Design an enzyme around this catalytic site. Structure first.
Site, PDB file in Angstrom:
ATOM      1  N   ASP A 168       0.819  -1.215   0.000  1.00 20.09           N
ATOM      2  CA  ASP A 168       0.000   0.000   0.000  1.00 20.09           C
ATOM      3  C   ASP A 168       0.854   1.267   0.000  1.00 20.09           C
ATOM      4  OD1 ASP A 168      -2.324   1.486  -0.076  1.00 20.09           O
ATOM      5  OD2 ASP A 168      -2.702   1.367   2.078  1.00 20.09           O
ATOM      6  N   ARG A 218       0.266   9.210   1.620  1.00 22.60           N
ATOM      7  CA  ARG A 218      -0.228   9.216   2.995  1.00 22.60           C
ATOM      8  C   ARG A 218       0.488   8.176   3.853  1.00 22.60           C
ATOM      9  NH1 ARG A 218      -4.424  12.351   4.538  1.00 22.60           N
ATOM     10  NH2 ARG A 218      -4.385  11.124   6.478  1.00 22.60           N
ATOM     11  N   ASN A 219       1.202   7.256   3.208  1.00 19.70           N
ATOM     12  CA  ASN A 219       2.012   6.278   3.925  1.00 19.70           C
ATOM     13  C   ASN A 219       3.499   6.621   3.868  1.00 19.70           C
ATOM     14  OD1 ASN A 219       0.194   4.443   5.123  1.00 19.70           O
ATOM     15  ND2 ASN A 219      -0.179   3.451   3.144  1.00 19.70           N
ATOM     16  N   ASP A 265       3.953   2.023   7.889  1.00 23.72           N
ATOM     17  CA  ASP A 265       3.077   0.860   7.743  1.00 23.72           C
ATOM     18  C   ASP A 265       3.585  -0.173   6.738  1.00 23.72           C
ATOM     19  OD1 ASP A 265       1.390   2.095   9.562  1.00 23.72           O
ATOM     20  OD2 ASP A 265       0.108   2.969   8.007  1.00 23.72           O
TER      21      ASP A 265
HETATM   22  C1  LIG Z   1       0.223   8.262  10.881  1.00 22.48           C
HETATM   23  C2  LIG Z   1       0.381   8.187  12.405  1.00 22.48           C
HETATM   24  N1  LIG Z   1       1.780   7.870  12.818  1.00 22.48           N
HETATM   25  C3  LIG Z   1       2.044   6.548  12.875  1.00 22.48           C
HETATM   26  O1  LIG Z   1       1.155   5.743  12.590  1.00 22.48           O
HETATM   27  N2  LIG Z   1       3.245   6.079  13.241  1.00 22.48           N
HETATM   28  C4  LIG Z   1       3.539   4.771  13.215  1.00 22.48           C
HETATM   29  C5  LIG Z   1       3.449   3.913  14.308  1.00 22.48           C
HETATM   30  F1  LIG Z   1       2.994   4.383  15.560  1.00 22.48           F
HETATM   31  C6  LIG Z   1       3.811   2.575  14.144  1.00 22.48           C
HETATM   32  O2  LIG Z   1       3.698   1.778  15.243  1.00 22.48           O
HETATM   33  C7  LIG Z   1       4.148   0.441  14.985  1.00 22.48           C
HETATM   34  C8  LIG Z   1       4.265   2.089  12.920  1.00 22.48           C
HETATM   35  C9  LIG Z   1       4.353   2.967  11.847  1.00 22.48           C
HETATM   36  O3  LIG Z   1       4.782   2.608  10.605  1.00 22.48           O
HETATM   37  C10 LIG Z   1       6.007   1.872  10.677  1.00 22.48           C
HETATM   38  C11 LIG Z   1       4.000   4.292  11.992  1.00 22.48           C
HETATM   39  F2  LIG Z   1       4.104   5.132  10.895  1.00 22.48           F
HETATM   40  C12 LIG Z   1       4.332   6.990  13.599  1.00 22.48           C
HETATM   41  C13 LIG Z   1       4.042   8.320  13.385  1.00 22.48           C
HETATM   42  C14 LIG Z   1       5.099   9.189  13.575  1.00 22.48           C
HETATM   43  N3  LIG Z   1       4.901  10.536  13.375  1.00 22.48           N
HETATM   44  C15 LIG Z   1       3.697  10.972  13.004  1.00 22.48           C
HETATM   45  N4  LIG Z   1       3.324  12.227  12.764  1.00 22.48           N
HETATM   46  C16 LIG Z   1       2.049  12.177  12.430  1.00 22.48           C
HETATM   47  C17 LIG Z   1       1.179  13.379  12.061  1.00 22.48           C
HETATM   48  N5  LIG Z   1       1.251  14.425  13.084  1.00 22.48           N
HETATM   49  C18 LIG Z   1      -0.107  14.914  13.363  1.00 22.48           C
HETATM   50  C19 LIG Z   1      -0.049  16.105  14.297  1.00 22.48           C
HETATM   51  O4  LIG Z   1       1.299  16.240  14.794  1.00 22.48           O
HETATM   52  C20 LIG Z   1       2.210  16.577  13.722  1.00 22.48           C
HETATM   53  C21 LIG Z   1       2.097  15.535  12.622  1.00 22.48           C
HETATM   54  C22 LIG Z   1       1.632  10.923  12.460  1.00 22.48           C
HETATM   55  C23 LIG Z   1       2.652  10.133  12.820  1.00 22.48           C
HETATM   56  C24 LIG Z   1       2.772   8.792  13.030  1.00 22.48           C
END
Ligand SMILES: CCN1C(=O)N(c2c(F)c(OC)cc(OC)c2F)Cc2cnc3[nH]c(CN4CCOCC4)cc3c21
Length: 306
Positions: free
Chosen positions: A165, A169-170, A183
């Site tokens: 995917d 957005r990812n 992700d």
């Molecule tokens: C989209 C939400 N998110 C995640 O899902 N993260 C995440 C995670 F917690 C995770 O836990 C296993 C695996 C992931 O992919 C490997 C992740 F990308 C890590 C992660 C790190 N930084 C982020 N920043 C944001 C967006 N924010 C929103 C408001 O504050 C400023 C920007 C989402 C986000 C964020």
């Protein structure tokens, strides 16, 4: 109850909960919650240092399957290992409470929102939706985003990881403008997939699937390369929506007939050909991520930052 399950404690990754200072929500998803936090002494060498991190946890209505997925995602990230251009695992909390998975924090949001906020008020792009816009990105910066993402995918590919995917957005952007893929270790659903259901953020992931993944549910690195092509289109539209005006039901026929998206107004022929090559009907004829990294590396050097 979380005490009724056996959570896998890994001493190298385990962090006490009272070392986290939880903050604002970073977003949601299927059944996961992600919050901002401050980790005290994440590195054993610097125990008095604070590090901004992202913490993923289960929601109020999480089942046993959700827990299994969250663990699975965590262990997967362990195995895949670290890279500059992916969201890395930093730690975990498996004891004295609900499972916490600690990962890198990207303060400038996902790539779509990052690019949309930096849209120039011009003819070649849609309107800037941000009430507080940021400085316009140069041409080199845009190619640089593509390179970084391609590099991260190149790494993930070498670790036998198929994202399934890959989209704007990812991809998350750090304070230092580093592109990090998100992700990539999600557990694949064992049930057939709804082609029409939107994500929690209103996205139709069908628009990123290769034809073979769309029609036969076949997922390979080649199908990720297809997705990377769509991402390339997203970058040079500065966060545009794929196949504008095209409904999902019609996307099946259109793709089969050889229909592809038009070149964005602000995009070089060489970069569009790269999209088209990624969008090759035959999976084996699409370029590899290795080849993509090599080309984008050359293109970055030749692209003006003026
Ligand atoms: C989209 C939400 N998110 C995640 O899902 N993260 C995440 C995670 F917690 C995770 O836990 C296993 C695996 C992931 O992919 C490997 C992740 F990308 C890590 C992660 C790190 N930084 C982020 N920043 C944001 C967006 N924010 C929103 C408001 O504050 C400023 C920007 C989402 C986000 C964020």
């Amino acid at each position: 109850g979380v005490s009724e399950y056996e959570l896998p404690e890994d001493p190298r990754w385990e962090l006490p909960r009272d070392r986290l200072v939880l903050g604002k929500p970073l977003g949601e998803g299927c059944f996961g919650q992600v919050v901002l936090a401050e980790a005290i002494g994440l590195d054993k060498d610097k125990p008095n240092r604070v590090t901004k991190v992202a913490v993923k946890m289960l929601k109020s209505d999480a089942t046993e399957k959700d827990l299994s997925d969250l663990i699975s995602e965590m262990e997967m990230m362990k195995m895949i290992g670290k890279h500059k251009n992916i969201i890395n695992l930093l730690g975990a909390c498996t004891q004295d409470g609900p499972l916490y998975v600690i990962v890198e924090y990207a303060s400038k949001g996902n790539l779509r929102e990052y690019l949309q906020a930096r849209r120039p008020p011009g003819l070649e792009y849609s309107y800037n939706p941000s009430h507080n816009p940021e400085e316009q990105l140069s041409s080199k910066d845009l190619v640089s985003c593509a390179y970084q993402v391609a590099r991260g995918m190149e790494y993930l590919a070498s670790k036998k990881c198929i994202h399934r995917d890959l989209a704007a957005r990812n991809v998350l952007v750090t304070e230092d403008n580093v592109m990090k893929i998100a992700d990539f270790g999600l557990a694949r659903d064992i049930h057939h997939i709804d082609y029409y259901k939107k994500t929690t953020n209103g996205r139709l992931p069908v628009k990123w699937m290769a034809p073979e993944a769309l029609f036969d549910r076949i997922y390979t690195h080649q199908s990720d390369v297809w997705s990377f092509g769509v991402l390339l289109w997203e970058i040079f539209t500065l966060g545009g929506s794929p196949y504008p005006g095209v409904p999902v039901e019609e996307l099946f026929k259109l793709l089969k007939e050889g229909h592809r998206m038009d070149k964005p107004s602000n995009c070089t022929n060489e970069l569009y050909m790269m999209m088209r090559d990624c969008w090759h009907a035959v999976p084996s004829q699409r370029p590899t991520f290795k080849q993509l990294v090599e080309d984008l590396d050359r293109i970055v050097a030749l692209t003006s930052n003026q």
